Symmetry: D2
Subunit: 116 residues, 4 copies
């Protein structure tokens, strides 16, 4: 699994469950093409978005739908969504974990990249 997402909730000290995630790739015409989507599990993890074959070199945008998440917990947060944009696989295939740590008015995001 070459692209995975893991989301934590910094208010509750828990995984952020059921968080929608949309992934896009930059096409040759410079538009954002839909690439994959899913939702975090009870563990706050999202796997199986793509395969090593389909996850070719390119610029990817991982949108994490944080506003929707917070509004279901009765919180009106600042951001619409967290937006993680990066070049992938430009030095050959890698595995990527995109982590995000959520607070109503702040988030952080970290990438862990490994060589298979």
């Amino acid at each position: 699994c070459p692209l995975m997402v893991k989301v934590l909730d910094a208010v509750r000290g828990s995984p952020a469950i059921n968080v929608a995630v949309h992934v896009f790739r930059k096409a040759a015409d410079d538009t954002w093409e839909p690439f994959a989507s899913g939702k975090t599990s009870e563990s706050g993890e999202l796997h199986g978005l793509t395969t090593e074959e389909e996850f070719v070199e390119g610029i990817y945008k991982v949108e994490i739908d944080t506003k929707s998440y917070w509004k279901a917990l009765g919180i009106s947060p600042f951001h619409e969504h967290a937006e993680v944009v990066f070049t992938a696989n430009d030095s050959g295939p890698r595995r990527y974990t995109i982590a995000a740590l959520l607070s109503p008015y702040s988030y952080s995001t970290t990438a862990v990249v490994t060589n298979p």
Copy 2:
């Protein structure tokens, strides 16, 4: 000054100087329209992007050009840029500070909204 940007460097423990910042406003057709831009000062701050009159309610995107920043320092970064997307509200506090704390493979961003 209703919208300010402040950028820190977590490797050097310093303001992030000369970071390009581009602000966009979401148009009716859901496209991103250029709104304001600048470069952070010696103090890592960017002031005077807009005015109270022009900064109406709506969805904005603040793009922080982190890749170029790390490149100029000879450090290989992960992200193309940092993206901060939010709704500007008239109800709440009047002044928005978008703060960002940069590391090569991680960043955080915080909104400080005050009267």
Copy 3:
């Protein structure tokens, strides 16, 4: 002002006001000795903890009383306090800003060291 503290609230998107801060210096016998204290202002800042004369090289601990802060807001926090432990150096930049960004179950802390 060689040592400043700035605290933000990541839940409210605001300065963290009235947060108690205790600074300690490591004594020769490796114990922590009270050095300075205060409470953050309306702007989440604490200035005037020490002077250039008194702030000699050594190991310092800045204790930020985060539990009491969350308690006063009726929110259950994880940490007893935030702890920032560092060596003050004469070689590098002269002014230390210890920044902290608080959430109930997480915090970050950053050192901004400037001339």
Copy 4:
């Protein structure tokens, strides 16, 4: 495993390997008693510090030896060590993951607490 530690390096986008961790408990006389210690693995994780029997209620301090870590990578960091202090097990046994994300002049720490 009721107490685990996971450390990431925000410069490299990798687990922080071989990071020393010392855990202390507050004794009835208000001193910090040594409780456990270890080092993060190749995955940046540290398990097996304690058992559910020995991990009783109390105030614990998890010291993560960050300065030593950075100095081996040629970096002179700001902090001596990250110091995570918390009450544990005061509402019955819980599992704790203490995460830390390291940069030379900044770190964050997050707790994920679950009910077994």
